Amino acid sequence: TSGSCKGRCFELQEVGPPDCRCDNLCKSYSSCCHDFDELCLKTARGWECTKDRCGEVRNEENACHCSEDCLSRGDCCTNYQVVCKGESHWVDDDCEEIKVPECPAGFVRPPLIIFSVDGFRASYMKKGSKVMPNIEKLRSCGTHAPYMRPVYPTKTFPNLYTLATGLYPESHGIVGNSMYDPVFDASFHLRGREKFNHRWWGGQPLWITATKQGVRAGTFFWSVSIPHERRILTILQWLSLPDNERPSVYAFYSEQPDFSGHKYGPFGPEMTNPLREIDKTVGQLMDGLKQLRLHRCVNVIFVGDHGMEDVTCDRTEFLSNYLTNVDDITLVPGTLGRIRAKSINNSKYDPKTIIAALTCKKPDQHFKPYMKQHLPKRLHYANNRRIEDIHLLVDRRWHVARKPLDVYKKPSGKCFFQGDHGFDNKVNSMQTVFVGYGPTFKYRTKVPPFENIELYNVMCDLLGLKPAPNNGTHGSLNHLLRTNTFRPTMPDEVSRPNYPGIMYLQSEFDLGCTCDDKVENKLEELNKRLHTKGSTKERHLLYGRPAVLYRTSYDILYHTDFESGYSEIFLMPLWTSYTISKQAEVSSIPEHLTNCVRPDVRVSPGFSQNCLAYKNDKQMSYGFLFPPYLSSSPEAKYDAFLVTNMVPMYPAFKRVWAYFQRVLVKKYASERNGVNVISGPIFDYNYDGLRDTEDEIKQYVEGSSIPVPTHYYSIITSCLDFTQPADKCDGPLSVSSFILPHRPDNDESCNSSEDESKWVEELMKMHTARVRDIEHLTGLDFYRKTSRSYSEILTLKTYLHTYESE
Numbered sequence: 050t051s052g053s054c055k056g057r058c059f060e061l062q063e064v065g066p067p068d069c070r071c072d073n074l075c076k077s078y079s080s081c082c083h084d085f086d087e088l089c090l091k092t093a094r095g096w097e098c099t100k101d102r103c104g105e106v107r108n109e110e111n112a113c114h115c116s117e118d119c120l121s122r123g124d125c126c127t128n129y130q131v132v133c134k135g136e137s138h139w140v141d142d143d144c145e146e147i148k149v150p151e152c153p154a155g156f157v158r159p160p161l162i163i164f165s166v167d168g169f170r171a172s173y174m175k176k177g178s179k180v181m182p183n184i185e186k187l188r189s190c191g192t193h194a195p196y197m198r199p200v201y202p203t204k205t206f207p208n209l210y211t212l213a214t215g216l217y218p219e220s221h222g223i224v225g226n227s228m229y230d231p232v233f234d235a236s237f238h239l240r241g242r243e244k245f246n247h248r249w250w251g252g253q254p255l256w257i258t259a260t261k262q263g264v265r266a267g268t269f270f271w272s273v274s275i276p277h278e279r280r281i282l283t284i285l286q287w288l289s290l291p292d293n294e295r296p297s298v299y300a301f302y303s304e305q306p307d308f309s310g311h312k313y314g315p316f317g318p319e320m321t322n323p324l325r326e327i328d329k330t331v332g333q334l335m336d337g338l339k340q341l342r343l344h345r346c347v348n349v350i351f352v353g354d355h356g357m358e359d360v361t362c363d364r365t366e367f368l369s370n371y372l373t374n375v376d377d378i379t380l381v382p383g384t385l386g387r388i389r390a391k392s393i394n395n396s397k398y399d400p401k402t403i404i405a406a407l408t409c410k411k412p413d414q415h416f417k418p419y420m421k422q423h424l425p426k427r428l429h430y431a432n433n434r435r436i437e438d439i440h441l442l443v444d445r446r447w448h449v450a451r452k453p454l455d456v457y458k459k460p461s462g463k464c465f466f467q468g469d470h471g472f473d474n475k476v477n478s479m480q481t482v483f484v485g486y487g488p489t490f491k492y493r494t495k496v497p498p499f500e501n502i503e504l505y506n507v508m509c510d511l512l513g514l515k516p517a518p519n520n521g522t523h524g525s526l527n528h529l530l531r532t533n534t535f536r537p538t539m540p541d542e543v544s545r546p547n548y549p550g551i552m553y554l555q556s557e558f559d560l561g562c563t564c565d566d567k568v569e570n571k572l573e574e575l576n577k578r579l580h581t582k583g584s585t586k587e588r589h590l591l592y593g594r595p596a597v598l599y600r601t602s603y604d605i606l607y608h609t610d611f612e613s614g615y616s617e618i619f620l621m622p623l624w625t626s627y628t629i630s631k632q633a634e635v636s637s638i639p640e641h642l643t644n645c646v647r648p649d650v651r652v653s654p655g656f657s658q659n660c661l662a663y664k665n666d667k668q669m670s671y672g673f674l675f676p677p678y679l680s681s682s683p684e685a686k687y688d689a690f691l692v693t694n695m696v697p698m699y700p701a702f703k704r705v706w707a708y709f710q711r712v713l714v715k716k717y718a719s720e721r722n723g724v725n726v727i728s729g730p731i732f733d734y735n736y737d738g739l740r741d742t743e744d745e746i747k748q749y750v751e752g753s754s755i756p757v758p759t760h761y762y763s764i765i766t767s768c769l770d771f772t773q774p775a776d777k778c779d780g781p782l783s784v785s786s787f788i789l790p791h792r793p794d795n796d797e798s799c800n801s802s803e804d805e806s807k808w809v810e811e812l813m814k815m816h817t818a819r820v821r822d823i824e825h826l827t828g829l830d831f832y833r834k835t836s837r838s839y840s841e842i843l844t845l846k847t848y849l850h851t852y853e854s855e
């Protein structure tokens with residue numbers, strides 16, 4: 050319909066119908082005024098000043114200007130000062146530290162510009178360095194990480210909306226580039242108009258956070274037909290607006306190098322040019338800022354959404370080769386797989402039969418099926434109705450498809466893609482980039498790799514905003530910044546522990562347990578009391594006891610070899626802590642102690658587990674949190690069989706756990722010069738990544754109130770300087786953790802029929818976790834007493850050990 054864009058080009062506030070629009074998204078909606086192209090998308094004379102244009106009389110038809118009034122008008126070509134005034138390109142100036150913001154009068158805060166690049170793999174920073182001098186200058190003069198970890202799936206929309214919200218895709222709702230919502234009965238796709246509907250997009254993205262708190266924000270989306278040079282000129286024009294109208298945060302988005310990467314693979318010879326072109330665009334922005342005297346005022350973030358892997362048509366696994374009944378399913382295909390029934394509310398569709406037909410069927414099978422609740426917890430990819438129950442994790446370099454006709458399209462199936470992304474977010478080729486440059490970022494500083502969910506908090510800090518609740522750990526990235534507005538502090542402990550002494554006589558217990566412990570001194574009797582009272586506690590609890598951050602009733606139990614926090618509600622430890630030195634020796638469970646379980650005289654029969662329940666439950670067995678194999682003496686070993694150290698374990702899981710405890714702990718202590726281990730149960734029956742309350746538990750040991758954990762964790766800490774033993778470390782710490790699913794079969798591990806040395810450790814690596822992940826799942830807070838700064842501890846708690854090569 051009707052109206053004009055005269056005096057409205059790239060207006061910031063979008064107008065409602067039936068009035069026509071002139072903002073940077075109007076093209077997407079087909080709702081621009083009829084003169085939008087003519088007035089707002091000028092192209093005459095290209096994007097660069099030449100010597101003969103210098104001082105020209107202003108011609109309003111030109112794309113940009115070289116006339117003398119152009120600085121005052123805000124619309125010079127970005128190279129104006131270089132061609133027409135003897136100025137140097139930004140890239141050609143030496144790095145000079147920006148100690149304080151150097152902003153024109155009227156700038157109330159340094160603006161933030163987010164420059165996002167689609168498909169920019171982390172290793173492009175080294176491999177394309179010779180063709181990206183503007184980017185290489187940002188990177189070396191500012192703050193950079195060797196790589197930034199994306200979220201899963203390593204697709205465009207989930208990651209860019211994660212960047213804007215600090216939320217996992219399960220929480221923000223953009224769980225893929227394609228998705229079907231069974232409540233909406235509608236599908237979201239990269240291409241098309243459904244994605245414009247606000248109903249898909251949850252959380253509070255940065256532009257909304259900013260606006261609600263009185264900080265003006267540019268649009269983060271761009272119509273695809275607006276060329277990059279015009280996006281840049283538009284941002285530079287918005288930056289010349291009056292103080293009261295000017296945004297403080299700006300976003301530029303590039304579809305490259307992703308668009309070429311898909312055609313040519315991540316390192317195709319055709320990739321050099323798209324990298325040169327992105328660099329040139331960075332150059333334009335920086336020259337533009339320098340003309341406006343804003344180059345030592347603005348904070349610039351150069352950030353990618355994901356990397357890019359070599360993927361061709363012939364590396365496609367077809368479901369039709371596994372299932373006889375493939376027309377019964379709908380598959381979301383590609384570098385991940387999501388399966389649901391073709392016919393909604395079809396009662397005779399069995400996910401269990403589909404999973405079974407897809408499990409370990411071909412020796413080199415290039416995907417693994419999972420019920421979504423069994424996916425590695427580090428992916429946080431389950432708590433959303435748009436995530437199908439059945440998920441296929443696809444090997445890097447591979448695709449999955451339903452039938453061959455979906456891939457090999459008529460006439461005779463030519464391929465025409467050599468690159469793709471979307472795989473597991475720990476995969477090297479999916480890693481992407483982060484550089485921060487400006488007064489608020491540090492000068493010439495490397496920082497360790499970190500996750501993109503953390504940036505939202507930092508952007509809010511950069512803008513003086515209070516972040517909406519999100520999945521970052523605020524303070525974990527304080528080390529990126531010259532000046533921090535946020536001072537993290539430890540959460541307050543909610544429940545204080547009881548410290549029970551000996552309160553019960555053996556004959557008060559009727560637990561159906563037995564142990565051969567009657568076997569067989571004044572000197573070694575005070576020593577026993579000392580231990581039960583906390584004398585070895587500084588050895589086994591190295592970083593203070595974990596804080597309990599919810600209301601509950603629990604006891605601290607001390608022993609020679611380990612300390613625990615025992616829950617009277619869940620009838621088992623919430624945590625068990627012990628230190629194993631490089632010198633410690635592994636021993637066996639003596640014959641006469643094979644089935645030994647001992648009542649704990651500090652803990653009431655009524656708050657204890659019982660052996661009878663385990664006897665009666667033909668599916669469920671038990672294991673121990675502190676391992677008897679690692680007892681310091683035959684006498685201390687009796688403590689490991691206390692009923693208060695016992696936890697429910699499926700026989701299939703006991704294979705995993707026993708190998709970890711008997712073989713792997715000692716190997717880690719050898720490799721790391723001692724380790725401290727904290728282990729415990731996790732209950733997450735509604736798969737939301739958060740500690741279950743007792744009324745959420747769906748499974749108990751038969752005929753008891755003993756709840757069955759969904760997972761078991763361990764956090765394994767040592768000295769970063771491994772020349773110092775774990776128990777006498779003066780400096781920073783080193784951690785690796787896992788959250789192992791507690792499953793009644795080893796179907797996940799295709800080699801599980803073999804010896805544990807051939808599969809267990811591979812499983813654990815797959816289920817590697819951050820300390821922070823375990824904290825959410827347990828309501829515990831770790832590392833309460835160290836000699837390290839809290840910001841450093843927050844970084845340590847966000848660390849993920851990925852087991853990739855470098």
Ligand SMILES: *[C@@H]1O[C@H](CO)[C@@H](O[C@@H]2O[C@H](CO)[C@@H](O[C@@H]3O[C@H](CO[C@H]4O[C@H](CO[C@H]5O[C@H](CO)[C@@H](O)[C@H](O)[C@@H]5O)[C@@H](O)[C@H](O[C@H]5O[C@H](CO)[C@@H](O)[C@H](O)[C@@H]5O[C@H]5O[C@H](CO)[C@@H](O)[C@H](O)[C@@H]5O)[C@@H]4O)[C@@H](O)[C@H](O[C@H]4O[C@H](CO)[C@@H](O)[C@H](O)[C@@H]4O[C@H]4O[C@H](CO)[C@@H](O)[C@H](O)[C@@H]4O)[C@@H]3O)[C@H](O)[C@H]2NC(C)=O)[C@H](O)[C@H]1NC(C)=O
Nearest residue numbers: 219220221222251252253432433434517518519520738825
């Ligand atoms: C990662 O970080 C995030 C963010 O911190 C964590 O996610 C949060 O987790 C909380 C606990 O699970 C959860 O609290 C819920 O919230 C319920 C209200 O939810 C709606 O409103 C939310 C707030 O909106 C306002 O603020 C934001 C600023 O952030 C603005 O942008 C808004 O516009 C508002 O001004 C809102 O965020 C939330 O969004 C979800 O749902 C949307 C609409 O469908 C989606 O678009 C969106 O993507 C979100 O979807 C996710 O989250 C939902 C669960 O909320 C989930 O189902 C989806 O799969 C997806 O993951 C809503 O619009 C509130 O009703 C709840 O209270 C009930 O339970 C509590 C205790 O659990 C009781 O104390 C309480 O009394 C009440 O019980 C009653 O109601 C029950 C039904 O729920 C009923 O059964 C019972 O019998 C009782 O009657 C509860 O507080 C937050 O909503 C959630 N936020 C987000 C964004 O996801 C996340 O946990 C972190 N992950 C990890 C691993 O740490």
Ligand SMILES: CC(=O)N1CCN(c2ccc3ncn(Cc4cn(Cc5ccc(C#N)c(F)c5)nn4)c(=O)c3c2)CC1
Nearest residue numbers: 074077206209210213244245246250269270271272273302
């Ligand atoms: C939540 C919200 O307010 N809305 C309103 C506007 N809706 C909308 C409207 C017009 C549009 N025109 C073009 N494109 C292409 C495109 C891709 N990208 C990369 C990118 C950039 C930023 C984020 C974020 N966050 C992202 F997810 C993807 N930018 N433009 C869009 O996706 C698009 C989306 C989306 C829903």
Ligand SMILES: [Ca+2]
Nearest residue numbers: 167168205354
């Ligand atoms: Ca992308």
Ligand SMILES: [Ca+2]
Nearest residue numbers: 733739740741
């Ligand atoms: Ca839960």
Ligand SMILES: [Cl-]
Nearest residue numbers: 204225226227
């Ligand atoms: Cl997807």
Ligand SMILES: [K+]
Nearest residue numbers: 663666669670
């Ligand atoms: K049993």
Ligand code: NA
Nearest residue numbers: 795796798801
């Ligand atoms: Na198996």
Ligand SMILES: [Zn+2]
Nearest residue numbers: 168307311470
């Ligand atoms: Zn892509």
